[PDB]
Amino acid sequence: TPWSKSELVRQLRDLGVRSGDMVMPHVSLRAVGPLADGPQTLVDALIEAVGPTGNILAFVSWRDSPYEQTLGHDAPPAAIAQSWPAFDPDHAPAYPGFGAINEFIRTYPGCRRTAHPDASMAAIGPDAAWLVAPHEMGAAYGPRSPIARFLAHAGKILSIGAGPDAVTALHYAEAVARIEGKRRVTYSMPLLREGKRVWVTTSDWDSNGILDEYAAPDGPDAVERIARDYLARTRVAQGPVGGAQSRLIDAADIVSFGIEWLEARHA
């Protein structure tokens, strides 16, 4: 039988989601199973669970981010530079590889979207505008990003059937860790700057592997290795949401752990 909004809200409350919480979900819809009115049912359940004073923050990115095509160039190649659509936060679809639920979050009425085309975050709730801005090129997941404000706002990570590699907030630990040899990438994004398309070239920490040994195309990256160690060592609320095994993680706690994990292992 497909899961109803009411059943999912009960499960989320049993897991520990409280009215007023600040939640960042990572969702595998296949693990959840069938939903009364499709994925919107889970979106509706999350909003009801955090209540009218709570907030949801999601890493949605952009279906058509030209990351691969501009990576490692000092400027966008001529072909992509002339024809690539500028990032339009109001209409740009979410990146499907990070979860099919994110397109439903970002089109939710009142949802705010951050300005970073590749690292775009979406937020719902009274603190949404404060969460999503600023989000500047060069500050994808580190200090001054929405992730940083999420961590300072008692954020909780809600993993619904997602694996330990999916914990975006741990890229903040990579950004701030005092370790040698940190990898950086250069890429270009097409922004809308008062109506006109402008290409911006920036560098930032490599979110596909902060060090060479975490950068194999098949992982495990540092996010995954940190999260596995953390979950083996920490009491974490665990339970079902629909058919999916779910966890509710204190975001500040796992990031602090990840900073220490990286700094203990790399001089």
Ligand X SMILES: CN[C@@H]1[C@@H](O)[C@@H](O[C@@H]2[C@@H](O)[C@H](O[C@H]3OC(CN)=CC[C@H]3N)[C@@H](N)C[C@H]2N)OC[C@]1(C)O
CB of 168 to ligand X, least distance (A): 6
φ and ψ of 235, to 5 deg: -75, 120
Q: Does 255 bind ligand X (CB under 6 A)?
A: no
Nearest-angstrom CA–CA distance, 21 and 197: 37
Nearest-angstrom CA–CA distance, 195 and 25: 32
Strand order across the 237-241 sheet: 112-113, 121-124, 55-59, 22-27, 156-160, 244-250, 237-241
Q: Which of residues 188-247 bind ligand X (CB under 6 A)?
A: 207-209, 219, 221, 223
Helix runs in 38-137, H state only: 40-50, 67-70, 78-83, 101-106, 128-132
Nearest-angstrom CA–CA distance, 62 and 89: 9
CB of 10 to ligand X, least distance (A): 30
Residue 232 assigned as binding residue: no
CB of 39 to ligand X, least distance (A): 20
Q: Does 186 bind ligand X (CB under 6 A)?
A: no
Nearest-angstrom CA–CA distance, 257 and 32: 29
Residue 127 assigned as binding residue: yes
Q: Does 165 bind ligand X (CB under 6 A)?
A: yes
Q: Find the helix or strand (DSSP H, E) in which 256 lies.
A: helix 251-265
C-beta of 35 vs 210, nearer to ligand X: 210
Q: Which of residues 72-91 bind ligand X (CB under 6 A)?
A: none
C-beta of 45 vs 191, nearer to ligand X: 191
* Binding-residue total with ligand X (CB under 6 A): 13
Nearest-angstrom CA–CA distance, 199 and 80: 11
Binding mask 35-74 for ligand X (x = CB under 6 A): --------------------------x---x-xx------
Residue 201 assigned as binding residue: no
Residue 13 assigned as binding residue: no
C-beta of 107 vs 208, nearer to ligand X: 208
Would you give the end-to-end CA distance of the chain in angstroms?
53
Tokens of 243: 């058919």
Q: Amino acid letter at 151?
A: L
C-beta of 95 vs 230, nearer to ligand X: 95
C-beta of 17 vs 101, nearer to ligand X: 101
Among 3, 95, 257, 261, binds ligand X (CB under 6 A): 95
CB of 228 to ligand X, least distance (A): 13
Binding-site entries for Mg(2+): 127
Binding-site entries: 26-30, 100, 127, 168, 171
Residues in contact with ligand X by the rule CB under 6 A: 61, 65, 67-68, 95, 118, 165, 207-209, 219, 221, 223
